Amino acid sequence: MVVSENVVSAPMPGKVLRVLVRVGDRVRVGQGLLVLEAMKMENEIPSPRDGVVKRILVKEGEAVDTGQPLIELG
């Protein structure tokens, strides 16, 4: 067993510009969860599935790296 962690991680290094959801929000596949500044663009990071936002692990302005947990889904 490994506990399945429903965590959305950064696809690439960057800076969190804004968070588009709140704990408890219902989300759909493809829905923007936050905006990441990377590759000289503001990239919306999508939810990979339908679900509920359980926890927000980063704050606006935070620098993240590849694979770093950003949002946990319920």
PDB file of C-alpha atoms in Angstrom:
ATOM      1  CA  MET A   1       0.000   0.000   0.000  1.00  0.00           C
ATOM      2  CA  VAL A   2       0.791   3.580  -0.576  1.00  0.00           C
ATOM      3  CA  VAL A   3      -1.821   6.126   0.406  1.00  0.00           C
ATOM      4  CA  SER A   4      -3.098   7.732  -2.786  1.00  0.00           C
ATOM      5  CA  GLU A   5      -2.392  11.431  -2.429  1.00  0.00           C
ATOM      6  CA  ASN A   6      -4.638  13.525  -4.677  1.00  0.00           C
ATOM      7  CA  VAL A   7      -1.993  16.198  -5.116  1.00  0.00           C
ATOM      8  CA  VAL A   8      -1.527  18.495  -8.086  1.00  0.00           C
ATOM      9  CA  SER A   9       2.162  19.314  -8.407  1.00  0.00           C
ATOM     10  CA  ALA A  10       4.053  21.918 -10.422  1.00  0.00           C
ATOM     11  CA  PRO A  11       4.733  20.750 -13.998  1.00  0.00           C
ATOM     12  CA  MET A  12       7.736  23.077 -14.094  1.00  0.00           C
ATOM     13  CA  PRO A  13       9.644  25.639 -11.979  1.00  0.00           C
ATOM     14  CA  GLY A  14       8.028  29.021 -11.536  1.00  0.00           C
ATOM     15  CA  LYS A  15       6.369  31.602  -9.323  1.00  0.00           C
ATOM     16  CA  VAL A  16       2.792  31.391  -8.073  1.00  0.00           C
ATOM     17  CA  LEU A  17       0.990  34.529  -9.265  1.00  0.00           C
ATOM     18  CA  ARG A  18      -2.507  33.852  -7.986  1.00  0.00           C
ATOM     19  CA  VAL A  19      -4.632  31.046  -6.566  1.00  0.00           C
ATOM     20  CA  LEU A  20      -7.992  30.600  -8.296  1.00  0.00           C
ATOM     21  CA  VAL A  21      -9.706  28.340  -5.790  1.00  0.00           C
ATOM     22  CA  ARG A  22     -10.434  27.978  -2.087  1.00  0.00           C
ATOM     23  CA  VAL A  23     -10.505  24.990   0.242  1.00  0.00           C
ATOM     24  CA  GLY A  24     -13.837  23.255  -0.279  1.00  0.00           C
ATOM     25  CA  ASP A  25     -14.402  24.391  -3.865  1.00  0.00           C
ATOM     26  CA  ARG A  26     -15.765  21.867  -6.336  1.00  0.00           C
ATOM     27  CA  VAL A  27     -13.497  21.556  -9.376  1.00  0.00           C
ATOM     28  CA  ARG A  28     -13.782  20.046 -12.843  1.00  0.00           C
ATOM     29  CA  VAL A  29     -11.144  18.463 -15.035  1.00  0.00           C
ATOM     30  CA  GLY A  30      -9.287  21.268 -16.787  1.00  0.00           C
ATOM     31  CA  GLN A  31     -10.397  23.956 -14.355  1.00  0.00           C
ATOM     32  CA  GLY A  32      -7.718  26.469 -13.447  1.00  0.00           C
ATOM     33  CA  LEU A  33      -6.497  26.072  -9.871  1.00  0.00           C
ATOM     34  CA  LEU A  34      -3.737  28.670  -9.920  1.00  0.00           C
ATOM     35  CA  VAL A  35      -1.549  30.716 -12.241  1.00  0.00           C
ATOM     36  CA  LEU A  36       2.159  29.971 -12.481  1.00  0.00           C
ATOM     37  CA  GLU A  37       4.704  32.289 -14.072  1.00  0.00           C
ATOM     38  CA  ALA A  38       7.123  30.195 -16.137  1.00  0.00           C
ATOM     39  CA  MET A  39       8.704  30.078 -19.602  1.00  0.00           C
ATOM     40  CA  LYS A  40       7.917  33.812 -19.780  1.00  0.00           C
ATOM     41  CA  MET A  41       4.198  33.131 -19.607  1.00  0.00           C
ATOM     42  CA  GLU A  42       1.405  33.050 -17.060  1.00  0.00           C
ATOM     43  CA  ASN A  43       0.324  29.425 -17.085  1.00  0.00           C
ATOM     44  CA  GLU A  44      -2.938  28.281 -15.592  1.00  0.00           C
ATOM     45  CA  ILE A  45      -2.388  24.951 -13.815  1.00  0.00           C
ATOM     46  CA  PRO A  46      -5.482  22.729 -14.317  1.00  0.00           C
ATOM     47  CA  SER A  47      -7.178  20.234 -12.083  1.00  0.00           C
ATOM     48  CA  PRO A  48      -6.456  16.802 -13.568  1.00  0.00           C
ATOM     49  CA  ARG A  49      -9.882  15.549 -12.502  1.00  0.00           C
ATOM     50  CA  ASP A  50     -13.263  16.404 -11.042  1.00  0.00           C
ATOM     51  CA  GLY A  51     -13.253  16.690  -7.276  1.00  0.00           C
ATOM     52  CA  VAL A  52     -13.046  19.006  -4.288  1.00  0.00           C
ATOM     53  CA  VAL A  53     -10.157  21.224  -3.207  1.00  0.00           C
ATOM     54  CA  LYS A  54      -8.877  19.846   0.096  1.00  0.00           C
ATOM     55  CA  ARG A  55      -5.815  21.975   0.782  1.00  0.00           C
ATOM     56  CA  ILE A  56      -3.802  24.792  -0.808  1.00  0.00           C
ATOM     57  CA  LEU A  57      -0.095  24.196  -0.180  1.00  0.00           C
ATOM     58  CA  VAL A  58       1.368  27.341  -1.750  1.00  0.00           C
ATOM     59  CA  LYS A  59       0.733  31.082  -1.516  1.00  0.00           C
ATOM     60  CA  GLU A  60       0.751  33.876  -4.079  1.00  0.00           C
ATOM     61  CA  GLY A  61       4.350  34.909  -4.723  1.00  0.00           C
ATOM     62  CA  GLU A  62       5.857  31.563  -3.726  1.00  0.00           C
ATOM     63  CA  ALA A  63       8.618  30.069  -5.853  1.00  0.00           C
ATOM     64  CA  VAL A  64       8.060  26.400  -6.648  1.00  0.00           C
ATOM     65  CA  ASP A  65       9.968  23.584  -8.345  1.00  0.00           C
ATOM     66  CA  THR A  66       8.979  20.672 -10.589  1.00  0.00           C
ATOM     67  CA  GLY A  67       6.905  18.067  -8.784  1.00  0.00           C
ATOM     68  CA  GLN A  68       6.311  20.332  -5.788  1.00  0.00           C
ATOM     69  CA  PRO A  69       2.831  19.845  -4.264  1.00  0.00           C
ATOM     70  CA  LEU A  70       0.549  22.797  -5.037  1.00  0.00           C
ATOM     71  CA  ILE A  71      -3.032  21.718  -4.350  1.00  0.00           C
ATOM     72  CA  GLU A  72      -4.440  18.593  -2.708  1.00  0.00           C
ATOM     73  CA  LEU A  73      -7.835  17.296  -3.858  1.00  0.00           C
ATOM     74  CA  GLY A  74     -10.244  15.377  -1.632  1.00  0.00           C
TER      75      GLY A  74
END
